[PDB]
Symmetry: D2
Subunit: 200 residues, 4 copies
Amino acid sequence: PVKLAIVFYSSTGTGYAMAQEAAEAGRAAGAEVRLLKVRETAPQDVIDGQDAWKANIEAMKDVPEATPADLEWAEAIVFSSPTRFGGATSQMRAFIDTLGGLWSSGKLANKTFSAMTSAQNVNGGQETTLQTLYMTAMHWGAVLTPPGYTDEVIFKSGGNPYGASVTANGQPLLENDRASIRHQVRRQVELTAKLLEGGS
Amino acid sequence: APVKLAIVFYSSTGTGYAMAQEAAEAGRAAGAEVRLLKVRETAPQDVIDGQDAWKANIEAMKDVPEATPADLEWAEAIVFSSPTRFGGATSQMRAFIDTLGGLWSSGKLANKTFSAMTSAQNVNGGQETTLQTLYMTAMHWGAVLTPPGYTDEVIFKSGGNPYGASVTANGQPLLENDRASIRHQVRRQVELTAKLLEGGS
Amino acid sequence: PVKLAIVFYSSTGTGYAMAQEAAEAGRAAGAEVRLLKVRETAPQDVIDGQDAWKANIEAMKDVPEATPADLEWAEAIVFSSPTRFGGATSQMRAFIDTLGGLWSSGKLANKTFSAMTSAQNVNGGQETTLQTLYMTAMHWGAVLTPPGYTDEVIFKSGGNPYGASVTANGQPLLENDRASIRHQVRRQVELTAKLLEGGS
Amino acid sequence: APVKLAIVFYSSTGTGYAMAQEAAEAGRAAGAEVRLLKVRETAPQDVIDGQDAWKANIEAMKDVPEATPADLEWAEAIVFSSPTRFGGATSQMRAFIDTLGGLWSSGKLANKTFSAMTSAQNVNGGQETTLQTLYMTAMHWGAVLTPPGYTDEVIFKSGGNPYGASVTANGQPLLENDRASIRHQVRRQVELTAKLLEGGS
Ligand SMILES: Cc1cc2nc3c(=O)[nH]c(=O)nc-3n(C[C@H](O)[C@H](O)[C@H](O)COP(=O)(O)O)c2cc1C
Ligand SMILES: Cc1cc2nc3c(=O)[nH]c(=O)nc-3n(C[C@H](O)[C@H](O)[C@H](O)COP(=O)(O)O)c2cc1C
Ligand SMILES: Cc1cc2nc3c(=O)[nH]c(=O)nc-3n(C[C@H](O)[C@H](O)[C@H](O)COP(=O)(O)O)c2cc1C
Ligand SMILES: Cc1cc2nc3c(=O)[nH]c(=O)nc-3n(C[C@H](O)[C@H](O)[C@H](O)COP(=O)(O)O)c2cc1C
C-alpha cells in the first residue's frame, strides 16, 4: 500500500479537523496513513490567552509529532497550514527549515506533494499560502499533485484548484469542504500508486 | 491640480466593466480627474458571436475609449482590472501591458501609484493570484504599490481581500459590499497619491 | 511511448534554441515529440522594427502552430515563454486562453507539466514567470514535475529548481543551460512513463 | 523631524548582516533616523553548535539589538531582509512577523513604507520568490510598497532584481554592485517616505 504522511499545523483546531478528514480519505483509498502534528513553538502564556488554542492542544495530545523521517517513510505528502499574513505559519516553517540534511541526501525527491490552508476571510490569503507551500516543495524535486478542478465538489466548496481551503469562523467544517478534502487526497493516493506501480 | 487617475479594465461579459465604473466614480467622488479605459478586444468576431453577453458587453462599451500608453504617461494613479484566466490576468490585459515597453524605457512609469482588481467564477479560483501577477508587474516599473490591506471594516465585509477588490462573477448586479471595498481601495489610493505629489514640489 | 508536447513562444530565438534543445532531449528519451510554436500576435509593423525578430519568425516558418488538440494528444507538456515584466508573454497567454473548452471537458488533467523561460537579467523574472505558468497548470489539475535540484547541472546553471531559465544576451545557448534543459525533459518523460505504464 | 527607518533582518552567517549594515549606512546618509534590528534567533543550541560560522556571527551581532513590534510602531519606513529557505523566508523572520497581530489589529502598521532584500546560495534559487512572499505579507498590513524597480543603472549591473536587493551568498565579500543597489533601494525609499509625510504634515 501507498504510504501517506499528513503534516498539519493548527492553533485553534480548523486545521486539525481538516487533517483528520484527509486521513480518513487516505485510509478509505487503501492508503497507509500517518497523521502528524507540527511542533508548537509559542510560549505558554500566549496559548493561555485564548481558549480554542489551549483546547486544541489538549485534543491533539495523542497525535504524534512530525519529523523529517516521516517524509522519508512517506511516498505522498500533504502539508496543511493556517495562513499568517498570506504566507504559512512560522510553526510550519520551523519544521521545514529542519529538512536540510534530508534534502541534500536526495530522499525528498519524487514524493507526491499537495497542500491545504485555512483563514478567516474567503480571500485573506487562501490561495497565496498554498502557493508558498508549493514553491517550497519544488526545491525538493517533488511531483506536485494539486486537485485543480477535477469535480463538481470543487466548484461546490468555493472552487480552489490549488488545494482545499476553509473559511475559519469557529464553526464546524462545511460538508462541501470535507468533500473537497476527501477528493484531493484520494486523487493524490491514486496517482502516487500509479507512479510506484510503473516504477516496478 | 487634482490627481490624474487612469482605470484600465478588460471585460468580456461585463462584471469587469461594472467594477471599473464604480472605481471610476469612487475617484471622481474623491476629487481625482479620472479616465475610464477599456482594454482592446483581440478576440475574433465569430468567437465573440457564440457568446451573447460578450456581444452585448462590447456594444454596451461602445463609447468608452481604448486604453493607450499615452493614458498611463498622463496619469499619476493607475488601477488595473482583469478577469482571471487560469489564475492569471487575461491575454488582452497582458497585450496592452506589452505595449508599455517604450514608456518603461523612458522611466515614465516610475512612482505612479498602482493597485488592481479581478473577478472570477469561483470564490478562490484565482481571485488572489491574478492580482499578484499584476502587482508583480507594477514592480518592474518602479510603481509605488497601494493595495487596500485591511485598512477598513468594509473589506472584511466583502470577503477580506487585502490584495485588492475581487468579485465573484455570477451574471448578477455587483453586491453592495463589493462596491464598498472597491470605493475604499480607490479613495485610499487617491488620498495617498495626493500626499505624494504635494511633498514633491 | 510518451507523447510530449513542447509548446513555446519566442521573438528573437532564445525560446526557440531552448525548445529545440528540449525536443531533442525528449526524442533521445524515447518520447514521441511535437515541437510547437505559439502564434505570433504582434502587429507586423512592430516586428519589422527588430532584425533578430523578423529573422526568428523566418527560422520557425516550418514549425507548426500549437492548438488545443496538441495538448489533448500529449501526456507530457513543456511550456516555454520569455518574460514580460515578470510574467509570460501575451502570445503565450493568448494560446492558453483558447483552452477553456478543453478545460471543461476535464481533458487536461493528469498530464505532466514543467516550464522554462528566458529573461534579459538574471533576476528579472526568471522565477516569477515560471511560477505563473505553473499556477495555470494547477487549474487544469496537471501533475507538475519541476526538476528541482535533482542534478549537479542544475547548480551549475544558476540553480533554478522551478524550471530551466536562460539569461538572454544575444549569444548562442551556453552548455550548462543545454544540459539542465535536457535533465528537465529527461526527468519528466521518465516520470510520465512510470505514470502511464503503471496506470492501465 | 527626519524619517524613522527600521531595518529588521535575519542572518545566520553574516551575508544578511553585511547587507543590512550597508542598508543602514545608506539610510543615515539619506538623512533618516535609522535603527538596525536583528530578528531574534530561535533555533536550538545543539544545531547552532554544529556550525561555528553561525556561532561566530551570533557573537559578532552581540551589540546589535533585537527587533520588536515597538521598533515597527516607531518606523515610518521598514526594510526586511531574510535569506532564502526553500524559496520562502526563514522561520525566524516569520516568527517575528507572527508577533505583529496586536499592531496589525489596531491598524498600527498601515501606510508605512516597505521594501525587502534577500540572499541565497544559488542565483536563480528563490531570490525573487522569497522577496515576493515578504511583499505579500506587507500588503496584508496595508503598507505602501516601494520596490526599487529598474529605476537606476546600478540594479542592472547587480543582477537586475526589481523586487529588492538580492545577493548570491558564496562566502565572498559583498560585491561593489550589490551595495550600490542596496543603497539605491533604501535611498529611494527614504526619499519617497519623506514625500508622503510632508504631504499631510
Ligand atoms: C498573526 C496571525 C496572522 C493572521 N493573518 C491572517 C490573514 O492573513 N488573513 C486571514 O484570513 N486570516 C489571518 N489569520 C487568521 C488565521 O489564518 C485563522 O484563524 C486560521 O485559519 C485558523 O486556523 P487554525 O484553527 O487551524 O489555527 C491570522 C492569525 C494570526 C494570529
Ligand atoms: C478561458 C477562461 C479561463 C477562466 N478561468 C477561470 C478560473 O481559473 N477561475 C475562475 O474562477 N473562473 C474562470 N473563468 C471565468 C472568468 O474568470 C469569469 O467568467 C470572469 O471573471 C468574468 O468577467 P467579465 O464579466 O468581466 O468578462 C475563466 C473563463 C475563461 C474565459
Ligand atoms: C515589453 C517586454 C518586457 C520585458 N520585460 C523584461 C523584464 O521584466 N525582465 C527582464 O529581464 N527582461 C525583460 N524583457 C526581455 C525579455 O525577457 C528577453 O528579451 C527575452 O527573454 C528574449 O528571448 P526570446 O528571443 O525567446 O524572446 C522584456 C522584453 C519586452 C519585449
Ligand atoms: C535549509 C536551508 C535551505 C536553503 N535553501 C536554499 C535555496 O533553496 N536556494 C538557495 O539558493 N540557497 C538556499 N540555502 C542557502 C541560504 O539561502 C544562504 O546561505 C543564505 O544566504 C544564508 O546566509 P546568511 O545567513 O549569511 O544571510 C538554504 C539554506 C538552508 C539553511
